[model samples]
Target: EAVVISGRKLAQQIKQEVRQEVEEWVASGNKRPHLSVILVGENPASHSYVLNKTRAAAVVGINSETIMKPASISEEELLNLINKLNNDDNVDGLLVQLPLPEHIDERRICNAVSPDKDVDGFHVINVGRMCLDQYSMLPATPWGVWEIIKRTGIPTLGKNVVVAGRSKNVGMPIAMLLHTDGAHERPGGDATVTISHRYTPKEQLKKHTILADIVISAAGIPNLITADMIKEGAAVIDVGINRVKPKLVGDVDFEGVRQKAGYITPVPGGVGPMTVAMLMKNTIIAAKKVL
Candidate 1:
């Protein structure tokens, strides 16, 4: 049997740490860190994610509010709203929820957010800074995964790590994080990293996965990684969330892979909670910058 990595438990621990820090900050007369989330359209999944984020923020004593906009809103109006938030002194961190209405230019909107307050770490400046391993807000999911690996005491130095995706926002950043030196001597870097994407043939993909000490899957394909693909005692971090009837599944064959792997994270209770907790961390960092 594998050691199940409980992200829910870890996330709660992180939130408690955040809560204590926030309490101390407030006791010192600093204003509460504030996070403003903008939601466009009514995508159920996005709504649910945003709700969880705001609730988590409240639990950690970060003042957070969601600004809901209609699906029909124009791109210009949305940009204008972002500008308004950017200029607001009270808003320490701002995140425009993803999957905004189809017509909006996602890249343009992401670029419009002030880098100082881009807690989602999606802005080009933050992306570039992260690429250079500079001090900057990090993408939440990837950061959360790294934290889980570190907190679980799974060694990464000089270990082979295969990241199975290449999305600029997720997979690529994760690979960058694992491959490079962290700013301020932060832990969980210095791994031998290989990236395998959809274009990689099954044979080549399996070759990389088999040699990996850790495998992180964000390919969005269900059951893409199987038991035979991974080495025994390898750590598996499943970042994909696919909706299957009556339940949700990850990119890995959890049952089969778990039996082979030493450590693994479940779909719903794994990286999701850590993402929110890290968002709170980014918000707190932004708040301190302005204080």
Candidate 2:
């Protein structure tokens, strides 16, 4: 009964919609929406993401640029660059590639971004705004997962959702969105969410997953979500991006879970594309708000 949900297809549709808005804005005598990305280090995964974001931005008619810095660049230097972009009137959206050098403080860097221009939506104030259910920029990956669930027409209201990860960027926000009230300024799915991490006992994780109506595996552990762990007919979204040699894979055992789940998203073509699409949308949204 499992059906593959093509995030790549849906992302194309969304990008087209965003493109129209960008075109309209430009036609009305506005400047092209600009997105600036600061990419640090040689993290292969992050580099791929930046490449995707850049291409998607161009597709949507948003002007985009990337500033590359060496892995050894000091934190202060990057922060200064961010501040420069934050104040640039032409820059509508700003993103800093994550997993910065171990010497750099990720939290401090994320919080340094101007909330108004933070398209990646990792700023502390933006995070707080999201937690308060106020209309705020959303982190891309979590939002991508939520978009997939909604676009697939899987009901979340009162459903049991198991999110097997707790990273601030992925699992935490996913749980928050699914469990929060839908009537709030930032609408949510109103699902009953269960959070599990590495410390979660194997048996306990299995118990929750078996009962879940929707299971999201963002734990970054390959083959973490198995066929036997999930309930039959449930929806599964895999958000992990792990590089296993030259092959990229997600948290789920794709072939195994695809046979059991009612809906599934594949690793390469799944949440990754949706995230870039959502980033385009956010960039345009940020551009509109500025004017």
Candidate 3:
């Protein structure tokens, strides 16, 4: 049976689960899970992403606060804001939206968020935990991608998976999660995993993609994975969001690859929705851990 991986539908289902968990905690008299997003500038893409997160959190019963910093704001001021949110007792999860203005130090601001409230999981401590295969809050996108594959029941026990990209945000952690001994077994993962980057020989990409039972691309390059690269019926997830001349597109050539893929995620609506949904899950976990 052909399974269309609708990220929107999958996200709604997971959102329901997270909402129920939050409701139970609230009924038990625990403080509600709250997420805070700090937007440093007015970049259109960043703004849209933050709005999606805010609306999704609201839908899941998570109280979310978005503080917008003017593009002209100084670097130190933003760090102070992040620190304040980190120490704020009411905040369960904190994330500083990316693509700061030229003057702001993105790395310093990211490190300022408290480890427990770092819901985006970009903090050094959380990154270290992920690297060490520990139990800290997982990065939203990688975990969300895994959840979608697991929920779909893809067969991965002995399959090969090739992920194209080495980005710390999605690719690096996902590659680790696929190989990590303790992750929930799923079709896209638990298969022997290989990761590729620009440095990889051009011919090696097709060799790896054809052998993979599943292929994930997060390189943010439009049409990075051509239809010819993947074997027929291989599951594909386009984690990349690249802006083309007229619009944004994913890494995979969607129109060219769909017929060949057993499953596929659309550019904007697929993993994008899932990422927001999983943030609610992480916030609830953080809130529960504190209690």
Candidate with maximal TM-score: 2
Task: Tell me model 2's lDDT, rounded to 2 decimals.
Answer: 0.92
Backbone clash total for model 1 is: 0
Q: Largest lDDT belongs to which candidate?
A: 2
- lDDT for each candidate structure: 0.90, 0.92, 0.84
lDDT by residue (tens digit), candidate 3, 83-161: 7877889998899888787787777887888888888888888888777766667889998888878888876667888
Worst lDDT 10-window in candidate 2:
239-248
Could you estimate the TM-score for every candidate?
Answer: 0.96, 0.97, 0.93
Alpha-carbon runs more than 4 Å astray in model 2: none
How much is the lDDT of residue 34 in candidate 2? 99
User: Tens digits of per-residue lDDT for model 1 on 173-256?
Assistant: 889888886444333378999998989998899989999999999998999999999899999999998887378899999999
* lDDT ranking from best candidate downward: 2, 1, 3
At residue 177, what lDDT does model 3 achieve? 79
